[PDB]
Amino acid sequence: YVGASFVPYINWAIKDAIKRGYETIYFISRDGHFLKQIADKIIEIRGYNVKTKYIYGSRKAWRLPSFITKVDDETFWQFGNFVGMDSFEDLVKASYLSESELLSLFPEFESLREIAENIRKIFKNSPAYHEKVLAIAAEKRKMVRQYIQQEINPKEKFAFVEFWGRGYTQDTFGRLLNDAFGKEVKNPFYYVRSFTDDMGTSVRHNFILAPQNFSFFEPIFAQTPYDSIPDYYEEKGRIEPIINHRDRSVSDLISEGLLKFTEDYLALNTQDEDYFDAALSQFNYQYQLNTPNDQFICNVFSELKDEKPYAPALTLKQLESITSKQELDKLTQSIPISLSKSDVKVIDYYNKIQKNYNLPAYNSTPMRKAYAVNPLE
Amino acid sequence: QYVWSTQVPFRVLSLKQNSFYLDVSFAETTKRKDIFLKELNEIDVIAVDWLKGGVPRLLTEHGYITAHKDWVKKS
Amino acid sequence: VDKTWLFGSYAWQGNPKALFLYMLVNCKETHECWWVADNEESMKSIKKSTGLKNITFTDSEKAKELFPHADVYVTENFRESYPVYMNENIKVFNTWHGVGLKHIELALGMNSVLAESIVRKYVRNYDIYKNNVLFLTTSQAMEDHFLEDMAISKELIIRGKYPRNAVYGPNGIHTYDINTLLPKNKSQYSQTILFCPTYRIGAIQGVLNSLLPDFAKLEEVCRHKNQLFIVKVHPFMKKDNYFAEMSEKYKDSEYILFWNDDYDIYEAFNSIDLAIIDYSSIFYDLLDAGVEKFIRYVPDLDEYQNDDYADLTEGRIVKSFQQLLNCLDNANIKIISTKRKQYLMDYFFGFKKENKSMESLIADVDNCQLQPKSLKELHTFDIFDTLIRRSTLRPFSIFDYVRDKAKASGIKFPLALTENWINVRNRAEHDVRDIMRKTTFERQSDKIEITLDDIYTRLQKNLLLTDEQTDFLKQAEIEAEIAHVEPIQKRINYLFSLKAKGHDVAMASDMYLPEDVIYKMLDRADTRLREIPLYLSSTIGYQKSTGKLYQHIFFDLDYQYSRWTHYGDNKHADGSVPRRLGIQTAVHDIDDFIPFENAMVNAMDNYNRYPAYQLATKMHRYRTQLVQENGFGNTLFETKYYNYA
Ligand SMILES: [Mg+2]
């Protein structure tokens, strides 16, 4: 499953970069670990002439420093920094400012310790806030600019290979590139898909041209053996990313499988390797995105810790404690998979309550294992 | 059993109290409930629109009516 | 009793209520007056609280008796629905809900949160609005403003006073004694203040908490002066927890009284000495009720600034809570100057000074003559599968054709593109659509319609195609769509018959093709169609599926129509959605294959799919002609179709 999901894409991207004349391919933090492993294996086997490098970063480590001369209005939009708040800690963290330092400017905010829209508005209305954020950003940008200048060779014709996103992170990183190299630096990003046109120096090469949402695959990438890069630091006069490691077992097995699959996949007798990449990708993405009762999507994928599972099975009392879709999303990231994993009585109760609580309609059947059925012990 | 003509418009008499539908499907949600075709009244039919199957519907300025011979009659 | 008047609104309030009470008192012999509530419980509440007996409710047997032969229907709004049995010649006395200098009704446009409701209201009841609504105007300025913002007949205007501002005077009407609601008798304060703030949009903390943070200091400053501070916040403001908290903390205070909204505050205007207002229309009402001391408490004047409030509102300015306290304690607020009150009263209620009375208003109404005009209708038409169709029926047939041309031209294409052209192109279109939907912020626009150029740009940029390939494919699709056009002659001739009857007709279509390609297709179906107005989604950016194209049509045309009918094939875009906008729909069925034809087409690969489309469409045309042209019976049709196919 994970090979079909990743390897054909990386193959397409590597071949497309060789075609477009890219000399170096950079893989960005977290999402780029497995993808760079795959690309290295492909280049080794096929003997392609292209270098690969790994770059550490993240939204948190790159958004604030990207504010060169202005704070992006996107920061105050539906997908800005004040998006996803669930508690007061979430609000204080999105604000960039401490609870005390923030409540000093917004006493009205002392309460609650629509709402998000008004919060974004009040944030947008303060020029002092804008200038303070700009100062903080110009200060945090020193280490990011030095990291870029030390890790990325600007005299080459290079590109970046990601997996999924809106494209705003790519825009901020391209702004950081321009500030670090002092010129209009074309940054092309490879995605499986993105929802935005080319903007400024950001160029976007997309693998699949279909209205599919690949956030689905975030759990797999979240098995990378270290947390999201929070920021940078300096030692030995060199800038380095803060890396707080995690256990390597899951990522070890995932990389084992991915490289086995790469070997097996490059050995296939294809009449047209590009067409097979495209066809296998189409089939595999369609299947994994529209098969919530699949044995392995149920028993393996949806059980990956994201630490709580991505879409675990549901219990009758858990559904008795819900009354909205918001409350249920806190319980699982995929209602179809969770239901396909739950007992028949749970499914029947969900059906009973869905018409009233306005929950998505469950249109699948319980998962039936297909191979290694029953306990093998 | 269906009353219709290739030559539109054409007058029809309402044998029974006939309802108006805003969709050839004659689905409940498309049946008008604000007004109806009174029994023994006449009305002009300005178009004949056919379902996917083989049943005709007679369009009036207020919506579709049935073509069944027990409910309408060409004048 | 000669005349019969019903009065209606969503609440026991307003000019409807004022005039209703004044007539039930001073017009018991010349008019029979009833109040129609929206439901039964509303009537029960009104009757329990007021003891009147001339109260019925909508669709009540009393209402079904009165409405068919009533004389006047008094309202404070352009109602969203009117009783279907309401008499043909009734006089809709629309006594508006306030005067001011803000846009309303049709002026709110398509960006308004009430756009759908406005379109529904007007599409439904334009005949009533234009031929039966006597709108009450109070001054020439207000009459001009309202005639600009609304669709009312200048001949049916009624000039006079606002009944709710001139009926509950000292010796006038009162359904309740004010002293029974106050801690002390009204003469038991040094004065009374009425605080009427407005519901502000962006409210981190409750609108009330931001305006009046510390109620303890307010009550202290009111005791020190022996004032009665009466708080009547906006309706939505009453939902906040701070409102209820402060109402409970001072539920039995001698100076801070949270007005019980179960009573009409207008009845008490004559008892109000001071008014603390911000941006609400009620100010003018107060000015018309005799109030003369005004405090404009506008802490949020920074927002409304940078855009005249100064010249058309009275009241000393106070922007800070501390300033409001200093003003309430200082007791330095003079009565409105004679010249300024004369100015404002002229500007806003000039037609008042014409010695206008309540009975004068009732006479002007009753003595009015309805001279209605017969209005034209509007008829919009879907294009694809309504006025025109495809010689191969299914849309994807086009794509098939295009692929076959690509693969046959000699220009080399990528295998993934040729062999999989159907999926490639359809999924690229839906991809571009999702991109539009997800980039409404980045584009600062709610329009989300795509164009053919967007689809082929996506394809070219992400498949690394040459300009030759992309232009070949795009021109092939355009030329194929044009060459496969066929007319649906009966609906075209019906459209033009409608136009010849004097109705206005137009076409509203959701399609990515450019407007010129659409016009070429129409011209190949029927040249006359080129002269009909066109609302193409690709040109406008709004679609019928979202209903936005219907709103655009409503606000773009000079809507003067007695009825709107939409003819189409889509159960949603041309049915559900338009019906939600109050539009009468005539939705027919799209052409479609039957089992044998479908299986034939579905059984072919790339080499044989287009001719299979041709043959299946020929079979469909044959059975169509047999059943719905020649009028054959079941057995004859079945025999002929079998022998053929
Ligand atoms: Mg259509």
Numbering used by the authors:
A (entry chain B): 650 to 762, 770 to 962, 970 to 1040
B (entry chain A): 1041 to 1115
C (entry chain A): 0 to 306, 312 to 649
List passages from the publication reporting this PDB structure.
The X-ray crystal structure of the capsule polymerase Bcs3 reveals a multi-enzyme machine adopting a basket-like shape that creates a protected environment for the synthesis of the complex Hib polymer. Supported by biochemical studies and comprehensive 2D nuclear magnetic resonance, our data explain how the ribofuranosyltransferase CriT, the phosphatase CrpP, the ribitol-phosphate transferase CroT and a polymer-binding domain function as a unique multi-enzyme assembly. The Bcs3 protomers build into a physiological and functional head-to-tail dimer, which is assembled primarily by interactions between CriT from one protomer and CroT’/CrpP’ from the neighbor protomer, with an overall basket-like shape. CroT transfers ribitol-phosphate from CDP-ribitol, generating a phosphodiester bond with the 3-OH of the nonreducing end ribose of the Hib polymer.
To study the location of Hib capsule polymer in Bcs3, crystals were soaked with oligomer fractions having a narrowed degree of polymerization (DP). A structure was solved by molecular replacement methods (3.6 Å maximum resolution) showing Bcs3 in complex with two complete repeating units (DP2) of the Hib capsule polymer and an additional nonreducing end phosphate coming from a third repeating unit. Bcs3-DP2 crystallized in the P 1 21 1 space group, with four molecules in the asymmetric unit. The overall architecture between Bcs3-CMP and Bcs3-DP2 is essentially preserved. However, we observed more flexibility for the CroT domain in Bcs3-DP2 than for the CroT domain in Bcs3-CMP. DP2 is clearly visible in the electron density maps and is present in all four Bcs3 molecules bound to an SH3b domain (residues 1,037–1,115), with the nonreducing end facing toward the active centers in the main groove. SH3b domains are the prokaryotic counterparts of the well-characterized SH3 domain family. The SH3b domain in Bcs3-DP2 revealed a completely conserved fold—a compact β-barrel, formed by two anti-parallel, three-stranded β-sheets. Notably, Bcs32–1093 and Bcs32–1068, in which the SH3b domain is disrupted, were completely inactive, strongly supporting the mechanistic role of the SH3b domain for Hib capsule polymer recognition.
